[PDB]
């Protein structure tokens, strides 16, 4: 016990630095990572460099990247004190800006948005350092003829949330973020469709579920960032039209009904939203399947990510005044399980017997000029570089786990895995835990 949440927060930020694509800054802290994907570009040659590599691969998947940005910004807004107490406010802002600077580039025209750079197969067929890639990296976009309400909506939400983050420190950037956010929401709302039906390569990696929750999510964030009642009216009208109160609860890259609900509860103070949030949280605490050691077991994919996402929803619910003490305590047990209460740490580079072989290319590689290829992937040795801060998939339903690089279910790491987790850490620090 007695975990240093401030340091885990800093570690999580190091994980995001390790996921950076493009030209790295002079003050980069994860120095084993080098400049890469410097030729990423749109169909007309527009600069698309930057952004985050999705997981252990080098594809830039826009949907989970936008989701990641929104959740990180969300925590920065509600639990800014946590970042400040950890002396990580500047880095926290940088983590959000690394994503939004890219979204701005990807927004090539008012109703055009690039949602992917790199093809799943060509990218995944390669195992090595990103700076060593030599395969073509196609860029895919959504537009008026091939829409993507979910992708455009989540990106609009991320931009709107980011505009709040930078409202005082960088007003000019804040204004720019908001302009793009408004345009992307209009695009998402005026041209309805699932982005993975347009960017078909994404259908087998980050498939669209039901884009409707994204429209409400984006509208709610825009209202928060502008105080423009039109967005609130749209958010609530669509919420009722789509009947979100009946949707399965939760917070994830593809479905965030609980996020929408706890957000609207705060923005409107309406009891109805609070009822839905309490019902969901109470269900998780009292009935959702758990491992014998106490970890919420929501699904086999990104198991810890699901528990940490739930923990963040609980922390947000506590802020509404809903069973604050019990909700915060339960959220802490989930984060604490990830940190080691179950017997070992599931955060790379942290705690007792952490995973040392995450399914991650860049960290597995030795420094150049030594070759990094599939033989490196096949190495019995731990990943050459410690991937500080990365939350892995985790143990199975019975708390069983084996550190294996080829086991993507349990050793997968991803930008969306650390989002809820990092924001929850900021909340725990803000609460003085």
DSSP state letters, 248-293: PP---SS--HHHHHHHHHHHH--HHHHHHHHHHHHHHHHTS-B-TT
Structure tokens at 390: 């990365």
Q: Which of 128, 148, 150 is nearest to 214 (CA)?
A: 150
Please give the domain boundaries of the chain with CATH numbers for all domains.
1-433 (1.50.10.10)
CA distance 110 to 108: 7
Known binding residue 43? Answer is: no
CA distance 14 to 387: 8
Catalytic residue among 57, 316, 403, 416: 403
Per DSSP, the residues of 234-254 read HHHHHHHHTTGGGSPP---SS
* Structure-solving method: X-ray
H-only helix segments in 138-211: 149-165, 171-190, 195-198
Catalytic residue among 78, 150, 412, 416: 412
Known binding residue 47? Answer is: no
Known binding residue 299? Answer is: no
Per-residue CA distances from 67 to 231, 253, 259, 267 (Å): 20, 6, 11, 20
Q: Which of 131, 188, 44, 81 is nearest to 432 (CA)?
A: 81
Q: Which H or E run includes 374?
A: helix 374-377
Length of the chain: 433
CA distance 169 to 84: 14
Per-residue CA distances from 71 to 92, 98, 217, 259 (Å): 12, 14, 12, 9
H-only helix segments in 87-228: 89-106, 120-124, 149-165, 171-190, 195-198, 212-226
Return the number of other C-beta atoms located less than 10 Å from residue 157's C-beta: 36
Residue 202: DSSP 8-state: G
- Cross-sheet strand order for the sheet of 139-142: 60-61, 113-117, 139-142
In angstroms, this model's resolution equals 1.4
Cβ distance 386 to 403 under 8 Å?
Answer: no
Is 412 catalytic? The answer is: yes
Triad 382, 386, 391: Cα angle to 5°: 100
Known binding residue 254? Answer is: yes
Name residues whose C-beta falls within 8 Å of residue 165's C-beta, 6 or more positions apart in sequence. Answer: 73, 76, 77, 93, 96, 174
Is 241 catalytic? The answer is: no
Q: Which of 243, 318, 334, 332 is nearest to 277 (CA)?
A: 318
């Amino acid at each position: 016990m007695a975990y240093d949440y401030k340091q885990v927060l800093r570690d999580s930020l190091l994980f995001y630095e390790a996921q950076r694509s493009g030209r790295l800054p002079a003050d980069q802290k994860v120095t084993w990572r080098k400049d890469s994907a410097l030729n990423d570009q749109g169909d007309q040659g527009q600069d698309l460099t930057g952004g985050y590599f999705d997981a252990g691969d080098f594809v830039k998947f826009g949907f989970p990247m936008a989701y990641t940005a929104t959740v990180l910004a969300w925590g920065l807004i509600d639990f800014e004190a946590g970042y400040s107490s950890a002396g990580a406010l500047d880095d926290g802002r940088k983590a959000v800006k690394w994503a939004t600077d890219y979204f701005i580039k990807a927004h090539t025209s008012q109703n055009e948005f690039y949602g992917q750079v790199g093809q799943g197969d060509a990218d995944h067929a390669f195992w090595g350092r990103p700076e060593d890639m030599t395969m073509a990296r196609p860029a895919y976009k959504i537009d008026t003829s091939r829409p993507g309400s979910d992708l455009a909506g989540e990106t609009a939400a991320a931009l709107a949330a980011a505009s709040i983050v930078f409202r005082n420190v960088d007003g000019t950037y804040s204004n720019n973020l908001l302009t793009h956010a408004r345009q992307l929401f209009d695009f998402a709302n005026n041209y309805r469709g699932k982005y993975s039906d347009s960017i078909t390569d994404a259908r087998n990696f980050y498939a669209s579920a039901d884009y409707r929750d994204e429209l409400v999510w984006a509208a709610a964030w825009l209202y928060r960032a502008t105080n423009d009642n039109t967005y609130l009216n749209t958010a609530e009208s669509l919420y009722d039209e789509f009947g979100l109160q009946n949707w399965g609860g939760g917070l994830n890259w593809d479905s965030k009904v609980s996020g929408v609900q706890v957000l609207l509860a705060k923005l409107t103070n309406k009891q109805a939203y609070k009822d839905t949030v309490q019902s969901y949280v109470n269900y998780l605490i009292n009935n959702q399947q758990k491992t014998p050691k106490g970890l919420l077991y929501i699904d086999m994919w990104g198991t810890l990510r699901h528990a940490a996402n739930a923990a963040f929803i609980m922390l947000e619910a506590a802020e509404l005044g809903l069973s604050a003490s019990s909700y915060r305590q339960f959220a802490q047990t989930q984060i604490d399980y990830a940190l080691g209460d179950g017997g070992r740490s599931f955060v790379c580079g942290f705690g007792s017997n952490p995973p040392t072989r995450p399914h991650h290319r860049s960290s597995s590689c030795p420094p150049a000029p030594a070759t990094c290829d599939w033989n490196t992937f096949n190495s019995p040795d731990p990943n050459y570089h410690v991937l500080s801060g990365a939350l892995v998939g985790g143990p199975d339903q019975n708390d069983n786990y084996v550190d294996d690089r080829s086991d993507y279910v349990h050793n997968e790491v991803a930008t969306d895995y650390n989002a809820g987790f990092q924001s929850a850490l900021a909340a725990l620090v803000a609460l003085g835990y």
